[PDB]
Design a binder for this molecule. Sequence first.
Ligand SMILES: CCCCCCCCCCCCCCCCCC(=O)OC[C@H](COP(=O)([O-])OCC(O)COP(=O)([O-])OC[C@@H](COC(=O)CCCCCCCCCCCCCCCCC)OC(=O)CCCCCCCCCCCCCCCCC)OC(=O)CCCCCCCCCCCCCCCCC
Ligand SMILES: CCCCCCCCCCCCCCCCC[C@@H](O)O[C@H](CO[C@H](O)CCCCCCCCCCCCCCC)COP(=O)(O)OCC[N+](C)(C)C
Ligand SMILES: CCCCCCCCCCCCCCCCC[C@@H](O)O[C@H](CO[C@H](O)CCCCCCCCCCCCCCC)COP(=O)(O)OCC[N+](C)(C)C
Ligand SMILES: CCCCCCCCCCCCCCCCC[C@@H](O)O[C@H](CO[C@H](O)CCCCCCCCCCCCCCC)COP(=O)(O)OCC[N+](C)(C)C
Ligand SMILES: CCCCCCCC/C=C\CCCCCCCC(=O)O[C@H](COC(=O)CCCCCCC/C=C/CCCCCCCC)COP(=O)(O)OCCN
Lengths: 122, 105, 71, 347, 115, 83, 171, 175, 98
Amino acid sequence: MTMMSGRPGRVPLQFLPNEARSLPPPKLTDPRLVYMGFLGYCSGLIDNAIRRRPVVSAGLHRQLLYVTSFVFFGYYLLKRQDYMYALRDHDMFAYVKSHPEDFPEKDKKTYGEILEEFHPVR
Amino acid sequence: PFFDVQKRLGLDLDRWMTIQSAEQPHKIPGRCHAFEKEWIECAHGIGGIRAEKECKIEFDDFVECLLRQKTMKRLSAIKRQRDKLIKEGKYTPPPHHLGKEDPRP
Amino acid sequence: LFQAEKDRRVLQMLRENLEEEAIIMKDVPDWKVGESVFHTTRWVTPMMGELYGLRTNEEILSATYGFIWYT
Amino acid sequence: MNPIIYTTLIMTVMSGTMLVMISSHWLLIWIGFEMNLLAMIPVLMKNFNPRATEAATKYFLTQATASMMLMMAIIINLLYSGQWTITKMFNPVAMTMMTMALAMKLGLSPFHFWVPEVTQGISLQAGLLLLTWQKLAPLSVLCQISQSINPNLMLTMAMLSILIGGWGGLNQTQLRKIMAYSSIAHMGWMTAVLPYNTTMTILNLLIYITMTLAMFMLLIHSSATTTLSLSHTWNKMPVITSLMMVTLLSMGGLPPLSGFMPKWMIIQEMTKNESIIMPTLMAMTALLNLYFYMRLAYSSSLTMFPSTNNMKMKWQFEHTKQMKLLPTMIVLSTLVLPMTPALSSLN
Amino acid sequence: MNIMLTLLTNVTLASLLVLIAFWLPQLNAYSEKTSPYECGFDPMGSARLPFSMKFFLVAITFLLFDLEIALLLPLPWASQTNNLKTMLTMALFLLILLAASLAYEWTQKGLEWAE
Amino acid sequence: AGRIASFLKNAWAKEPVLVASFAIGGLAIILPSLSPYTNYAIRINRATPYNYPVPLRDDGNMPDVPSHPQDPQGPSLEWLKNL
Amino acid sequence: PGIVELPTLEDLKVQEVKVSSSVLKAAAHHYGAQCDKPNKEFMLCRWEEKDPRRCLEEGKLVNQCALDFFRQIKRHCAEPFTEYWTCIDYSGLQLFRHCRKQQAKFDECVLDKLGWVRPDLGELSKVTKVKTDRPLPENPYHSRARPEPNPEAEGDLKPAKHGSRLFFWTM
Amino acid sequence: MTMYIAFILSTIFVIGFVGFSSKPSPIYGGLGLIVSGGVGCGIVLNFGGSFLGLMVFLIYLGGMLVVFGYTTAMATEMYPEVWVSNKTVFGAFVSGLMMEFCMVYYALKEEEVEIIFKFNGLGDWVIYDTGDSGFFSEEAMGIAALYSYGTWLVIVTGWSLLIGVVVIMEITRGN
Amino acid sequence: MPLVYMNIIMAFAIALAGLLMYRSHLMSSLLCLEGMMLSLFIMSTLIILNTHFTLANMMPIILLVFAACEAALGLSLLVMVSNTYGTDYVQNLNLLQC
Ligand SMILES: CCCCCCCCCCCCCCCCCC(=O)OC[C@H](COP(=O)([O-])OCC(O)COP(=O)([O-])OC[C@@H](COC(=O)CCCCCCCCCCCCCCCCC)OC(=O)CCCCCCCCCCCCCCCCC)OC(=O)CCCCCCCCCCCCCCCCC
Ligand SMILES: CCCCCCCCCCCCCCCCC[C@@H](O)O[C@H](CO[C@H](O)CCCCCCCCCCCCCCC)COP(=O)(O)OCC[N+](C)(C)C
Ligand SMILES: CCCCCCCCCCCCCCCCC[C@@H](O)O[C@H](CO[C@H](O)CCCCCCCCCCCCCCC)COP(=O)(O)OCC[N+](C)(C)C
Ligand SMILES: CCCCCCCCCCCCCCCCC[C@@H](O)O[C@H](CO[C@H](O)CCCCCCCCCCCCCCC)COP(=O)(O)OCC[N+](C)(C)C
Ligand SMILES: CCCCCCCC/C=C\CCCCCCCC(=O)O[C@H](COC(=O)CCCCCCC/C=C/CCCCCCCC)COP(=O)(O)OCCN
C-alpha cells in the first residue's frame, strides 16, 4: 500500500532531491501554472466578496499577492510531481530490463493469418 | 504519516530503545542477543517482503529463544516417558538425579 | 576460575541429562537423542528447565528462587 | 480560559500529534496519544455548560478505552517478538487489537456512537478541531502498519462507516450532527482504500480536511448551528450562502468539483485490485450523503425562508473578526479538480 | 520465604487477639447498646450521605505529584553513570518543572480550600 | 539596584521560606558548572570496574597495552589515592 | 535440526580447587598477580569462541596454575594466610578493611619468601594483551550466507514518457 | 511444579480483578484493587522486580486513598452495595470466578489455544536464565538509565505532568 | 507460555469487560480503567524481566505516570459531573443523542 516511500537512498524531508535537477524545469507559461494563478485570482475575488468590498477593484495589492503566492507554490509542486513521475518510469524500465523472463517478446502475427470470429449484425 | 525527523537530523530520539542488541548500560546483554543479532543482519536492507521469506530461519530461532515453546515440548515429552517408565518399574533414576550426587565447584 | 568451573558444571549436567534421556527415550520410534530445537549450530546458553528437568524439587527451588528468597 | 493557557493547550495537542507522527518507538506513539488526549480534554470544555461536560466525559471514556487496547496490543506484539519499532506487527491477535483501537480512536463504525454526541455538545471551533486535527495521528499509525492489516475487518468497518454515516445524516436538523455523520462517512471512504494505497488515503484526508475547514468556518461566520438558524443567512449574507451551497455540492462528490476526485481515485485504485462490487456499493451509498447535503442547500441558499423583524438591526453591522484562510479553503474545496496529477507528489 | 512466614505470623497473632477479645468476655448485646453514637441522641440523617470534600483540587494534584516520586527514586543509582552532566541536567530539569507546577497552582488559588 | 533591594527586603520580611528555597535552588543549579571536582566525579565513576576487562589478542602492534597488570602501560589511579 | 555434541564425563574431570570463598578472596590479589597469563588466555578463548566446549584445556590450565599458587602459599607460610582468611571469613560482607594487620603480615611473608608484590589500586582491572597460538575463529556465530541485496538504482533520469498518463491529462 | 507460588499469586490477582470488575460500591472496588496491587507486587518480586512491584504498590496505595476520599465525597448511596447484596453484582462475581476456573482447568489438564495460543504449564521456573554475574541489579541499572539514555522520555513525561496540573485546574474551574 | 501470562491477560480482559459494562456509578468504571493499567504494568514488567531487556525497565514507570494523568483527568471530569447533577450516575449524561 506504500509503493515508493521505502525507495533506497531516499532522504526523508527534501521535497526535491538533487537528481531532480537533471529534468527540464516547467516553463513559466505552463498551463498548470496559469491555472494556479487563476485559482489565486479567484481566492482574491472571494476574499473581496466576503469582506463586503468591491469584488473586482478593492484590493489590488492583495490580489497580486494571492496570484504570486499561488504561482510560486505551483511551480515547485509541478517540479516535484514531474520528478516523481520520472522516478516511476525509470524504476519501471529498469525492472523490465532486469527481468526479461517476465516480459517476453513474442512474435506478432499479421491479421491475414490470425483467425477472428465474425458476428453478423441482423 | 511517518516524517523521519530523526534520520534527517541524526538525532536518535528513541532508536536507542527499539531493539535488545543496542548498547545496554554496563554492556548487560539480552537473553536472546545473538539470535536477534543474526536475524537483524540477515534482513537488513532487503525490504520487509523479502525479509519474511529469506530470513525465516533466523526469525524462527529468535522466537524459539524468546518463548522456548519447542524446548518445553521436548522436556514435557521426556518427563512423560520417564514417569510412564517408573510407574511400571522398568526405569530407575540415577543417584545423581535423586539428590545423592557428588557436588563440584 | 569461577567461569571455568561454571562451564564444566553446566557441561557435566547436560551430559548426565543426555545419558538419562538416551536410556529413557529408547522405546520411542522416531526420537533422536540430543536433537536440538534450533537450526543454528552455535552454542546456546542452556535454559533453566533443561539443566534441572530430571532432578528433585528442592534443587529446583534452590536454583530458581534461592537467591531471590534469601534474606 | 486565559489566552496563554489556550495557546499552550493547542500547542500541546499539536505536539502530541507530531510525536505520534515522528516516532519510531511504540511507547512514544502511545505517549503522543496520551498527551494529545490530556491537552484535548480542556479544549472541549472551554465554554462551560453541562452539554460540554457530558461531551468531554464521553470523549475521555472512549479515548481512554482505545488507549488501553492500544497498549495491550503493543504488549502482545512485544511478547511474541522483542520488537518496539512500528514496522509490521508480528501477531494477528495483537494486530486485531491495534485495528480495533485505532478504529475506536477514529470513530469508525460500529465505534461511531461517540462522534455525533461529542460534536453536538461542543462549540463550532472545538468541533472543527475535533473533526480535522484529531484524525491525523491514528491515520498515520494505520498508514505505517498498512501491510499488516486484515483486509476483511478493515473493509467491513469502512463499509459500515459509510452506510451508517449516510443513514444517520439523513435524520439530522442540527448542523454539528450532520457534519459528524459526514465525517464518519468520509472516514469510511478513507479506510476503504488504505490496504491498497496509502497515497489515496492521504489525498482523501487532505481534501476532506480542506472541505471540512471551509464548511466549519462558513458556519462560524454565519453563527448558526441549526437548519432554521442557517435559513436566515440569505437575508443578511447572500454571498456566504452561495459559497456554502457550492461547498455542499463539492462535499457531495459531484463533478467537476473537488470532492469528486478522492472518490474517483479510490474507485479506480480499487478496480486495479479486482475490487468492483464494494466501490459500487460505496458510491451508491454516498448518494445518501449527497441527499442530505442537497436538503441543507435547499433550506439555505436555493430557496428563501421567512425572516424576522430584528434582522434589520443586524443589517447595519459588519463582522468584527475576519477569518484569513476562509477564501483559500473555499477555492481549494471547489476548484482543484484539473490539478489531479499532482497527487504523485504525495508518495 | 522468610518474609511470607513473618507476615503470616503477624496476621495470625492479630487474628488470634481478635478471637480472644471476642470469645473470652461475657456479651450482653441489646439494641440500645449497639445503636449509633452521637453523644446523646439519635442521628438525624445517615452516615452514608455525601460528605463534601473542600480539598478536592489538592487531592487530584497529589496523584500527579506522587508519580514525581517514582521518577526521582532511581536517582541514587543514576549518580553512578559516566555522563554526570546529562543526568544532573535532566534531574534538575525534572524538579524545576515540579517546582513550577506547584508555583502555578499556588498563584492561581488552587491550594485554597473550597468555601 | 534599589528596587530589587526593596523587593528582597520585603520577601525576607514576609516569606523567608521562599527566599531560602530560591537561593538554595539557584546555588544548586549554578555551582556545579564552576566546580573543578565534577570532572573528578566523572573519572571516579569511570574508574569503577563493574565488569570483567576482556583481554585483547596481541598482534605485535599495541605498544600502549600492557601484557601484565603490573606493567607500566594502561590507566593509572595514582591521582585517586592522593584525592 | 542436528544433534548437540557434548564432552564426555571423563574429559570434564580436573583437579578441583576446594578452598572456600574467604580463602579465595584473601588470596585474590596475589593470585591475579601470579596466575595472570593462563587466566587471560582462558578469557580470550572464552570471549572469542563463545562456546564453553572449545576452551576446556585452558580451564584445566587455569585450575593447574591456581593449584600451584595455593601449593606455594601452603609450602612457604600457611599460618599468616590462615589468620588473614579467618579474619576475612568472620565478616558477613568479607570486607578487606576490617583485616589490615593480618593482610599486612601475609604481605611481608609473601614478599620475603617469594618476592610477591601486591598489585596497586587500578592494576588488576586493566585491559591487557594476550599472545596466543590459537587461530582466530572465522564464524563464531555460525552465520548463514547473507541474502543478496536488491541490485541498485542507476542511470540518467529522463522525463516520464508522455507525461503522467493519468486518464485524459497530457502532462 | 515447584510450590506453584506465582500461580496462586496470579490467581488471587485475577480474583481481585473480578472483585472490582463486578463493580460493587467503590469502597470495596478500591479494596479489591489494593489486593490486586499487592499480589502483583509479590508476583513481580518473585521474578526479580523488587523496585517495580514495590513502586506500583506504593502508587496504587496513594491512588486508592484519593479514590476513597472521592468515593466518600461524591459516590455514596444510602446502602452501599457488596458482592452479595445485589443479584447483578453477585452474578458477575460468580461468572468471573467460574470463567477463571474453567480457563485454569482447561489450561493445566490439557493443551488448548484459548484466545491467542496454547500452553502446558510446568511452572514459571522453566523459562529462567540461570545467569551468574554482577555487583548490581539489572533492573536498577535499566531504571537508572532513564537519566542518561532516556532524555527524550524525561522531557515528554515532565511536560505531560505540568500540562496535567494545568489541565485539572482548567477543568475544575467551572463558571 | 507460562500460565501466569494467561492469568494476567485474563485480568486485563476482565477489567476491560468491567469497564465496557456499566452500572450506575461513574467511579466504578474509573477503577476498571486503573485495573487495566495495573494488568498492563504487570504483564509488561514480566515480559521485560524474562527477556532481560535492560533498557525497558523504565517503560512501566512511564506507563504509571500516564496512568496517573488519566486518573486525574477522570477524577476532574467526575467532579464536574457530580457538581452538575449531585450524583456521579452515568444515566444523567443523556443530554446528547445520536
Ligand atoms: C470551466 C472553465 C472556466 C470556468 C470558470 C469557473 C466559474 C467562474 C469562476 C469562479 C470564481 C470567480 C468569481 C468568484 C468571486 C466572486 C464572488 C461574487 O459574489 O461576485 C460578486 C461580483 C458582483 O458584485 P459587485 O460587482 O461587487 O457589486 C454588486 C453587489 O455586490 C451586489 O452583490 P450581492 O452580493 O449583494 O448579491 C447577492 C448574491 C450574491 O451571490 C453571488 O454573487 C454568487 C457567488 C458564488 C461564488 C462562486 C463559488 C466559488 C467558485 C466555485 C465555482 C464553481 C464552478 C463549477 C460549476 C458549478 C457551478 C456552481 O446572492 C444571490 O443573489 C443568491 C444567488 C443564489 C443562486 C445560486 C447560484 C450561486 C452559486 C453560483 C456559482 C457559479 C460560479 C461563479 C460564477 C461567477 C460569480 C461571480 O461579481 C463580480 O463582479 C466578479 C466576477 C468576475 C469578474 C472578473 C473578470 C475579470 C475582468 C476581465 C479580464 C479578462 C481576463 C482574460 C484576459 C483576456 C484578454 C482581454
Ligand atoms: C485541496 C487541495 C489540497 C491542499 C493541500 C494543502 C496545501 C498547503 C500545504 C503547504 C505546502 C508545504 C508542504 C510541504 C513543503 C515542505 C515539506 C516537504 O519536505 O515534505 C516532503 C513531502 O512533500 C509533501 O508531502 C508534498 C505536499 C504537496 C501537497 C499537494 C498535493 C495535492 C493533491 C493534488 C491537488 C492539487 C493541489 C493544488 C495546490 C493548491 C517530505 O517527504 P516525505 O517525508 O518522504 O513524505 C512523507 C509521507 N510519507 C513518508 C508517508 C510518504
Ligand atoms: C495470646 C495469644 C495466644 C492465645 C492462646 C489462647 C487462644 C484462645 C482463643 C479463644 C478461645 C478461648 C475463649 C474462652 C474459652 C472458649 C469458650 C467458648 O469460646 O467456647 C464455647 C463452645 O461451646 C460450643 O458452642 C458448644 C460446646 C460443645 C462443642 C462440641 C465440639 C466438639 C466437642 C466434642 C466433645 C468430646 C471432646 C471433643 C474434644 C476433644 C462457646 O462459648 P459461649 O458460651 O458462646 O461464649 C461465652 C464465653 N464465656 C462463657 C467464657 C464468657
Ligand atoms: C528544531 C527546534 C528545536 C527547539 C524546539 C524543539 C521542541 C522539543 C523540545 C526539545 C527538543 C529535544 C532535543 C533533545 C533530545 C535529547 C538527546 C540529545 O539532546 O542528546 C542528549 C544530550 O543531553 C542534553 O543535555 C539534552 C537535555 C537538554 C533539554 C532539557 C531542556 C530543554 C527542553 C525544552 C522543551 C521541553 C518542555 C518545556 C520545558 C521548559 C544525550 O546525549 P549524551 O548523554 O551525551 O549521550 C547519550 C548516549 N549514551 C547514553 C550512550 C551515553
Ligand atoms: C532559580 C531557582 C529555581 C529552583 C529553586 C526553587 C525550588 C523550590 C522553590 C519553588 C517552589 C514554588 C514556590 C512558589 C511561590 C509562590 C508565591 C506566592 O504567590 O505566594 C504568595 C506570597 O509570596 C509572595 O510574597 C510572592 C513572591 C515573593 C517573592 C518570593 C521569593 C522570590 C525570590 C526571592 C529570593 C531570590 C533568590 C535568592 C537571593 C537572595 C539574595 C542574596 C501568596 O502567599 P499566601 O500563602 O497565599 O498568603 C496567605 C496568607 N496571607
